[PDB]
Design a protein around this ligand. Sequence first.
Ligand SMILES: *[C@@H]1O[C@H](CO)[C@@H](O[C@@H]2O[C@H](CO)[C@@H](O)[C@H](O)[C@H]2NC(C)=O)[C@H](O)[C@H]1NC(C)=O
Ligand SMILES: *[C@@H]1O[C@H](CO)[C@@H](O[C@@H]2O[C@H](CO)[C@@H](O)[C@H](O)[C@H]2NC(C)=O)[C@H](O)[C@H]1NC(C)=O
Ligand SMILES: *[C@@H]1O[C@H](CO)[C@@H](O[C@@H]2O[C@H](CO)[C@@H](O)[C@H](O)[C@H]2NC(C)=O)[C@H](O)[C@H]1NC(C)=O
Ligand SMILES: Cc1ccc(-c2cc(C(F)(F)F)nn2-c2ccc(S(N)(=O)=O)cc2)cc1
Ligand SMILES: [Fe+3]
Ligand SMILES: [Zn+2]
Ligand SMILES: [Zn+2]
Lengths: 335, 6
Amino acid sequence: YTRVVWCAVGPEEQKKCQQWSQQSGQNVTCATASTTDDCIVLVLKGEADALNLDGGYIYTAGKCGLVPVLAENRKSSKHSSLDCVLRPTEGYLAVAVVKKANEGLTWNSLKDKKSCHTAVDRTAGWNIPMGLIVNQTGSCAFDEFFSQSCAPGADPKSRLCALCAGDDQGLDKCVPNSKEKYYGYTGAFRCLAEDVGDVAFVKNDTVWENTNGESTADWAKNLKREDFRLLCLDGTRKPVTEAQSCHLAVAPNHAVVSRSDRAAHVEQVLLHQQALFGKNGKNCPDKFCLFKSETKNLLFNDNTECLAKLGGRPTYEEYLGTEYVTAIANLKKCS
Amino acid sequence: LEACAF
Ligand SMILES: *[C@@H]1O[C@H](CO)[C@@H](O[C@@H]2O[C@H](CO)[C@@H](O)[C@H](O)[C@H]2NC(C)=O)[C@H](O)[C@H]1NC(C)=O
Ligand SMILES: *[C@@H]1O[C@H](CO)[C@@H](O[C@@H]2O[C@H](CO)[C@@H](O)[C@H](O)[C@H]2NC(C)=O)[C@H](O)[C@H]1NC(C)=O
Ligand SMILES: *[C@@H]1O[C@H](CO)[C@@H](O[C@@H]2O[C@H](CO)[C@@H](O)[C@H](O)[C@H]2NC(C)=O)[C@H](O)[C@H]1NC(C)=O
Ligand SMILES: Cc1ccc(-c2cc(C(F)(F)F)nn2-c2ccc(S(N)(=O)=O)cc2)cc1
Ligand SMILES: [Fe+3]
Ligand SMILES: [Zn+2]
Ligand SMILES: [Zn+2]
């Protein structure tokens, strides 16, 4: 046993991590950086041990030698006696979401429209839709496809950041952390909800979790699921209840990564921390809930039931799967 | 394909 130093991305995660640190009696402590890429460099330097990453960022971390440790597991759809920690993960569905009232927008008419992305380099927000678009258009000029976008982590003066809003004060426009109003799954879906954009690239669960009273958050509390449609790759639009037949890809769940030399320790500490603070952990809700943050998905997604053990001690390529890896590789050829 | 980005 040593202490595990977690890396928080931006100040809202830093505050949650400090609460966790306090509750864990400094079994976990906190390092903080402004972007996920900077947290990954902190882990490579050995100045932090671990953080939880979207698959696109697991690709970056894994090219640098970091390894997957445990994966987010949300509620299974299909029955299982299996304990959450031992259950195989079922990826999530990457979708393209639009307003029902924006009639006649389909997959085939996205050129020159306004788009909302979780962040450059993330799976559902970026790698899957821009990979598909580069391929279908035969051009690497994916920075000129949409007329304007919010794609946190792109050049703040470029059209890919034209729609980003920055923080409370309008500072930090387009930074890829939760201070940007339109960052991440919930930020990109808010960008669509507010009709800042015409299309949001998020995951199926985002739409459900921020509609029909599922969020009380001020911009979401009044949104109705029937006012949204999914874009299918065949050019059709479906209701958001049809994501199993109308998605862009199945994504590998977000997962914790660490240096190889610290993975075993990180895994043990985390399994013990979720026993205390995870979904009905000994001390959640009374002292601290590791997987809650009032819908902001800070450190972990709010829909996480547990962090689950991986089968086969996978390398990052085995975890992401060979198809997704080659999709990312192909897209990164553009820049 | 190649080296670490950093
Ligand atoms: C902080 O970490 C320590 C180290 O593992 C924990 O102390 C252990 O508690 C277990 C029960 O879970 C005891 O059987 C052992 O005596 C302790 N282990 C060691 C190595 O001394 C402690 O429970 C942790 N606390 C929190 C709040 O995270
Ligand atoms: C899309 O996401 C939603 C939200 O996660 C899924 O709906 C959940 O499904 C589980 C069982 O499968 C239920 O126990 C939850 O109550 C549902 N949540 C909500 C807010 O309704 C939905 O199944 C996903 N759709 C697909 C095709 O995967
Ligand atoms: C974009 O197109 C490339 C080129 O076809 C796709 O890459 C191929 O993917 C298949 C299936 O995984 C492999 O068998 C081929 O070897 C890959 N080709 C190359 C040149 O590597 C890629 O999957 C497509 N991107 C998306 C997001 O669908
Ligand atoms: C229900 C479900 C769950 C995950 C996936 C999936 C998709 C992908 C990809 F390639 F499409 F990205 N990988 N990938 C995946 C592959 C291997 C592992 S591993 N090595 O840990 O067993 C973990 C995840 C698919 C369906
Ligand atoms: Fe993701
Ligand atoms: Zn599919
Ligand atoms: Zn293997």
